[PDB]
Design a protein around this ligand. Structure first.
Ligand SMILES: [Zn+2]
Ligand SMILES: [Zn+2]
Lengths: 196, 229, 288, 115, 229, 112, 53, 124, 57
């Protein structure tokens, strides 16, 4: 489960280019430009305007999620065959994923590289009334991390802020399971009386 | 769909909810659940019943400033004119309570000696904003006028709705606090069984002298008093 | 589809295959000539001054004429005919309805003969409008004065006007809310219509292959095209559900579900109401 | 009148010389908290701006101004009567407010964030 | 209502909730989450707010979102500006954790809601009653423990670790980031490396073990006990 | 930028009425200034009367032990004030006509 | 405590007799109800568990 | 005192009735028998603009100052993982993980290819 | 079950001798399948396994 020190420098340098990603997607949806700084009062006014609308927050989520999924796809596509310490036959974690024995290449990427964007009900991490996604962050923070982008992996650990968003994504996969089977159970019963 | 919901608790941890609805007429109603029913009195009936008010004290308490704010001064005279039109026979405080004690007389189990301005005083001291207690009628008057500039500031969209699920607008009803709430309403049912037992005796004329120590003993050996079970 | 046999689908659509000699600009121009345009979609503000017999000077602010004629293809000669034939009639049908349930910048004047004759005729056609003017030069404002009686009490006029502006249509082909030009999937230049009206799209043969138009409202393919076309829609719409989730089901199952739902020539569900026409009593008793 | 107990009417109503010429006399409505003595203080530092930090007895106060209702009452002649001051109502010329302040300390960032 | 929200930070455990049908409805408290039992002395606070810039509510007669209503326990006591009310909320927190004012209890919460555009209705809301959720954080001037409730927490800036204290935004810091988990969710070894449904599932599997119910088993008589030897 | 003080009048001679906005009270009116005799920050009661109206006020019980107001009289030429420690009276207005009331019960009922 | 603070929110449950006053034919001889009660509780005390027979 | 369309008594502060609803040349309060037999103020105007978010449209959204809609091809998916597409041989593939079952089963990945667009699904 | 949600029934009380034995002679009390961990992502159990053996020594 360990990347080699050559390849572990690779995921640092690509994740070094993600600190600007949150503002640039937020500067794009506000129709500003020129790398206006995050503390711009004419920027923070527009982010509050976006916050009160369910439409405009859907746009800012979709722009910023698809922009940070690129950095997620650059770290994986550079590391997981190449940056690992043990290569394929001896690396049983990959051989369980390549053979189809158990797991996928997504499980191997979240262990070795990073978790990625914690998408909640399709959109992104929810937000308070004050423009704060947690009490740890500045209100109307245009950080990618503040929106729920986990730059940590399960090999090395996830920070307390991004451990809280990952429990949000963990629970929506469990409340949706409890409401899963009751839906399609009655659809099948109802077919098997006519077509019976 | 609009409204202002408050949950007022007494100093004995017993609660009371007073919801403040917005109609599409400029009309605002006051909602409360007394026994298990649910009653709907207009708001300027209460605002004129709590303390001695003019119709400009009600105006200034809502329109503090921004007289030029045209949204507020037009919703409001469908609420001050709507009371003067519908209730022209209610001029001062000691006559709206006569009206308010008359309609609610049956439901609060009022005695035949209580005057209507004593029954209506009890309704205002048992339901509306019970976290300010009795003799805080000025403070109960200023809180409703605050709760109308929250309702009118929400129909205009100057205020997001408060989320009732979001852990800032909710607190924890504890274990023993619930246990003392229910224990109060068992000894309230216990006094009401003493009265319902004596009224059975005065349907007859058997032996009723309320100054007698041995008639009190006969009543209370007939009322079930095992609250502990 | 399967349960309840919804004749009112929540999101009914319609896929319109355009020709191969209609351009992308003439497609996007054709989109704007279909989508409905409320009167609320060309208004910046509505300023209503109530003075007190009673009066109500309703002043409208439209957007600039080079903005709603480009976004909605609406000329200022349309707004004259929309307001003075549809809006003021609907407005007075709400003011009278409320009173019956109650008693239980610049300045422009010196009109010519055209504007004067427009004014006095519409005053005769209506009940209490008494003054009327519309910006004929720039198409930026309308202007009229509802005088009610000298007896009526306070009326929330701005709440009345907002509900009527959002219900007066300038240009609506019926049952059709919006047309859109999506990305061409595998070279299929098509148009997606939020709503179903097959009868209207036949009149648009200069832009549409009308023998290739495709919906997902099965109860509306059934009414227009018949029972075998509706049956072909069911096997295509159950397939679109499973092919989205990359789930392969065989068409032999989907043809037998579809040929059960179309066994009476109608579009019958799997529920009590679809089961009502059957022979077996104990099948029905055991169901619900 | 004077139905509740403890209440005696006022007699020795001292003179309030509201002259009103035209030089001029201005009537003010300044406030004070309970942590100040009126008769001890000599000079009243004031400005049309707010930056008016008055320091009394190891406290720091703040005189706030506001230009943009309350009614003044003055005695009649000698019998009390408290008649309304007017012209021929009457507002105040200036209103102020003295507020107790407190100095929050700056956060010692060189100490409170340890690596 | 099953949705995990950010306002439950430090008050409800994000992990320790049972999988299945009561998922999200049966959430547990955090580690250091105390709940007020008696109400605190707030008879002396209006003497302190009037010493600050609060104009009294009975003379002023103002209303609206353009000013900052000042309420203690749901009793409107005064009115300030929005700029003046922010200074009052900070001084009341400064005099609180510095235990020298003889009227301010530390379990008071100062719920300042700043003005905004179409946000929550502004005001300054003090609470001192029973039943409030409360958790400790470190106030960054004076380096002292502060007590913060969930109405306050939405508008604060509480750093998670002291290494993440940014200049001139953070006023508080957590003592330890493990003050936000439950008791049972905090005993899972290296819980920050597991996947999130697996930390949630241990919290349910940790209840259902056979361990040691107690040592005084020869003086009890239960239906069944499971005892790992 | 200081301003000196002529004198500090501690004795009660000026009161500040707090009526509703837009209050006339015609000029031939007399107001009584009552006073609790306890010699600290004192609780007053106003009362006045004319032929059609009657209206009383009082110092508010919450603030007047904690918040003191002073009416100053300012001279711009001598650059000084003189101070008059005034109370503020939360003042209502009743009418001498609308003090009627109906029967204390329904007075005719024997049905429950 | 909250119990003794809660028994003073219920302090009046009253009834009357149906017996008259038996004076002359007067105006208070027509409106007399009877003699009032006020059954009420002013102190409640939970003791501690003990053993009694 | 004329406040908007409301006129109050300058003695008792009560709401006077509408001067166009009483009979001729007298308005007077119910409590204070007022001294207004005049109907002095003829025009009482109240200019009432509509709310700025009362008419939602696509043209008001362009008159807003932020990006209200996504364009037709100005948001591409960032997710890519090099799995071989079994229909055309493409390597780039947009993945999509949503959690189906309870806390006894992991995540299930949706594989949508880039060029062709064939939907593919891998269970575990 | 371990402390990571890795539960599963005892499939066979496997006899001692035909169970793999270390260099030290130690034979494991519990054999757990490595094919659990790819879909579970319980890496707290790998480092608990690694910190527990450090702590015993
Ligand atoms: Zn009057
Ligand atoms: Zn492909």
């Amino acid at each position: 489960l360990r990347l080699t020190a050559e390849g572990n420098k690779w995921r640092t340098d690509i994740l070094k280019t993600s600190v600007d990603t949150g503002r640039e997607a937020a500067a794009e949806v506000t129709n500003l430009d020129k790398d206006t700084p995050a503390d711009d009062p004419e920027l923070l006014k527009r982010l509050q305007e976006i916050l009160r609308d369910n439409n405009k927050s859907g746009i800012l989520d979709a722009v910023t999620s698809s922009k940070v999924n690129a950095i997620t796809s650059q770290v994986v596509s550079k590391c997981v065959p190449d940056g690992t310490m043990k290569k394929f036959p001896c690396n049983s974690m990959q051989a369980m994923a390549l053979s189809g024995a158990k797991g996928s290449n997504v499980n191997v990427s979240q262990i070795m590289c990073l978790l990625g964007q914690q998408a909640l009900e399709g959109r992104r991490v929810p937000v308070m009334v004050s423009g704060k996604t947690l009490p740890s962050f500045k209100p109307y923070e245009t950080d990618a991390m503040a929106g729920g982008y986990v730059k940590g992996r399960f090999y090395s650990g996830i920070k307390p802020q991004e451990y809280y968003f990952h429990c949000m994504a963990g629970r929506e996969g469990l409340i949706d399971t409890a409401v899963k089977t009751s839906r399609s159970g009655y659809l099948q019963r109802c077919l098997t009386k006519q077509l019976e | 769909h609009y409204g202002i919901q408050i949950r007022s608790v007494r100093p004995d941890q017993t609660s009371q909810t007073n919801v403040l609805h917005y109609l599409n007429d400029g009309q605002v109603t006051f909602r409360f659940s007394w026994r298990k029913n649910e009653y709907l009195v207009p708001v300027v009936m209460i605002l004129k019943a709590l303390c001695h008010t003019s119709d400009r004290e009600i105006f200034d308490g809502i329109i503090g400033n921004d007289v030029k704010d045209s949204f507020l001064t037009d919703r409001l005279e469908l609420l001050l004119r709507g009371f003067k039109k519908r209730y022209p026979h209610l001029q001062n405080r000691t006559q709206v309570l006569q009206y308010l004690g008359d309609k609610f007389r049956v439901v609060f189990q009022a005695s035949p000696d209580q005057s209507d301005l004593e029954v209506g005083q009890e309704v205002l001291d048992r339901i509306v904003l019970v976290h300010l207690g009795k003799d805080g009628s000025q403070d109960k008057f200023r809180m409703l006028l605050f709760m109308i500039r929250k309702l009118y500031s929400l129909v205009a969209g100057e205020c997001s709705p408060d989320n009732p699920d979001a852990t800032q607008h909710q607190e924890v009803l504890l274990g023993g606090f619930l246990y003392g709430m229910i224990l109060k309403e068992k000894i309230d049912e216990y006094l009401q069984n003493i009265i319902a037992q004596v009224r059975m005796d005065i349907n007859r004329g058997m032996a009723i002298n309320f100054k007698d120590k041995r008639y009190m003993s006969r009543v209370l050996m007939r009322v079930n008093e095992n609250i502990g079970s | 589809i399967v349960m309840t046999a919804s004749a009112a689908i929540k999101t009914p659509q319609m896929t319109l295959p355009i020709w191969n000699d209609v351009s992308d600009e003439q497609a996007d121009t054709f989109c704007k000539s279909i989508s409905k345009v409320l009167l609320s979609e060309v208004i910046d503000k509505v300023i209503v001054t109530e003075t007190t017999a009673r009066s109500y000077v309703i002043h409208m602010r439209f957007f600039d004429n080079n903005e709603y004629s480009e976004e909605y293809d609406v000329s200022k000669e349309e707004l004259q005919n929309v307001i003075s034939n549809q809006f003021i009639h609907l407005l007075e049908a709400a003011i009278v309805k409320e009173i019956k349930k109650q008693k239980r910048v610049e300045a422009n004047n010196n009109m010519n003969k055209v504007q004067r004759d427009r004014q006095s005729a519409i005053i005769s056609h209506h009940r209490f409008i008494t003054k009327y003017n519309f910006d004929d030069e720039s198409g930026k404002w309308c202007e009229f004065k509802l005088e009610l009686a000298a007896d009526t009490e306070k009326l929330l006029m701005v709440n009345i006007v907002e509900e009527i502006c959002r219900k007066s249509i300038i240009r609506q082909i019926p049952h059709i809310d919006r047309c859109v030009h999506p990305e061409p999937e595998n070279g299929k230049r098509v148009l997606v219509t939020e709503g179903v009206n097959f009868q209207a799209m036949w009149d648009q043969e200069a832009f549409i292959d009308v023998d290739g138009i495709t919906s997902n409202d099965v109860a509306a393919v059934l009414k227009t095209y018949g029972v075998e076309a509706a049956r072909n829609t069911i096997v295509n719409e159950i397939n679109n559900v499973f092919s989205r989730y990359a789930i392969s089901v065989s068409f032999r199952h989907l043809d037998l579900i579809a040929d059960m739902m179309t066994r009476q020539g109608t579009y019958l569900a799997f529920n009590r109401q679809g089961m009502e026409t059957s022979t077996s009593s104990f099948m029905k008793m055991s169901y619900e | 009148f004077s139905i509740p107990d403890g209440f005696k009417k006022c007699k020795h109503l001292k003179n309030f010389p509201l002259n009103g010429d035209n030089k001029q006399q201005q009537v003010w409505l300044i406030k004070f908290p309970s942590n100040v003595d009126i008769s001890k203080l000599k000079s009243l530092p004031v400005d049309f701006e707010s930056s008016t930090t008055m320091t009394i007895d190891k406290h720091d106060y703040k005189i706030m101004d506001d230009t943009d209702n309350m009614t003044l009452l003055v005695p009649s002649e000698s019998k009390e009567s408290l008649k309304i001051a007017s012209t021929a109502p009457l507002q105040f010329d200036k209103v102020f407010s003295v507020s107790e302040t407190a100095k929050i300390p700056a956060i010692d960032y060189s100490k409170v964030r340890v690596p | 209502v099953r949705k995990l929200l950010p306002e439950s930070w430090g008050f409800l455990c994000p992990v320790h909730t049972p999988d299945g049908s009561p998922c999200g409805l049966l959430n547990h408290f955090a580690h250091k989450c105390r709940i007020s039992t008696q109400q605190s002395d707030v008879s002396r606070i209006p003497s302190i707010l009037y010493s600050l810039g609060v104009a009294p509510a009975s003379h002023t007669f103002a209303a609206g979102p353009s000013l900052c209503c000042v309420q203690i326990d749901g009793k409107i006591i005064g009115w300030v500006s929005h700029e003046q009310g922010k200074i009052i909320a900070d001084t009341l927190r400064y005099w609180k954790v510095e235990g020298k004012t003889p009227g301010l209890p530390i379990d008071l919460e100062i719920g300042y809601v700043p003005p905004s555009t179409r946000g929550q209705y502004p005001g300054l809301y003090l609470f001192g009653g029973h039943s409030r959720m409360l958790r400790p954080v470190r106030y960054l001037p004076l380096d002292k423990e502060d007590i913060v409730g969930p109405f306050e927490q939405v508008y604060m800036n509480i750093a998670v670790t002291p290494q993440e204290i940014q200049n001139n935004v953070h006023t508080h810091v957590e003592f330890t980031p493990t003050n936000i988990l439950s008791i049972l969710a905090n005993l899972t070894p290296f819980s920050d490396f597991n996947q999130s449904p697996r930390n949630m599932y241990q919290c349910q599997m940790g209840k259902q073990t056979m361990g040691t119910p107690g040592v005084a088993l020869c003086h009890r008589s239960d239906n069944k006990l499971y005892r790992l030897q | 930028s200081e301003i000196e003080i002529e004198s500090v009048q501690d004795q009660p001679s000026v009161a500040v009425g707090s009526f509703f906005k837009g209050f006339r009270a015609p000029s031939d009116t007399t107001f009584d200034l009552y006073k609790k005799k306890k010699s600290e920050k004192d609780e007053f009661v106003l009362h006045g009367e004319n032929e059609r109206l009657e209206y009383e006020g009082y110092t508010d019980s919450s603030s007047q032990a904690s918040n003191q107001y002073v009416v100053g009289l300012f001279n711009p030429e001598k650059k000084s004030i003189q101070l008059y420690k005034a109370p503020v009276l939360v003042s209502k207005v009743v009418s001498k006509s609308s003090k009627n009331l109906r029967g204390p019960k329904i007075k005719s009922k024997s049905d429950t | 405590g909250l119990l003794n603070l809660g028994v003073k929110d219920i302090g009046e449950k009253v009834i009357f007799d149906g017996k008259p006053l038996n004076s002359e034919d007067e105006i208070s001889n027509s409106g007399y109800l009877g003699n009032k009660l006020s059954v009420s509780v002013e102190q409640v005390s939970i003791a501690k568990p003990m053993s009694n027979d | 005192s004329v406040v908007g369309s409301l006129i109050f008594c300058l003695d008792c502060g009560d709401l006077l009735e509408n001067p166009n609803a009483v009979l001729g040349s007298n308005v007077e309060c119910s409590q204070c028998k007022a001294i207004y037999p005049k109907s002095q103020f003829s025009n009482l105007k109240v200019v009432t603009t509509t709310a700025d978010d009362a008419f939602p449209s696509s043209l008001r959204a362009k008159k807003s100052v932020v990006k209200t809609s996504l364009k037709k091809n100005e948001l591409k998916d960032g997710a890519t993982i090099k799995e071989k597409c079994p229909q055309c041989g493409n390597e780039e593939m947009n993945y999509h993980t949503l959690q189906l079952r309870s806390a006894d089963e992991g995540a299930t990945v949706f594989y949508t290819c880039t060029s062709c667009g064939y939907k593919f699904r891998t269970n575990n | 079950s371990s402390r990571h949600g890795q539960k599963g029934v005892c499939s066979r009380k496997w006899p001692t001798i035909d169970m793999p034995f270390s260099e030290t002679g130690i034979q494991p009390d519990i054999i757990i399948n490595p094919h659990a961990f790819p879909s579970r992502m319980t890496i707290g159990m790998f480092v608990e396994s690694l910190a527990g053996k450090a702590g015993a020594l």
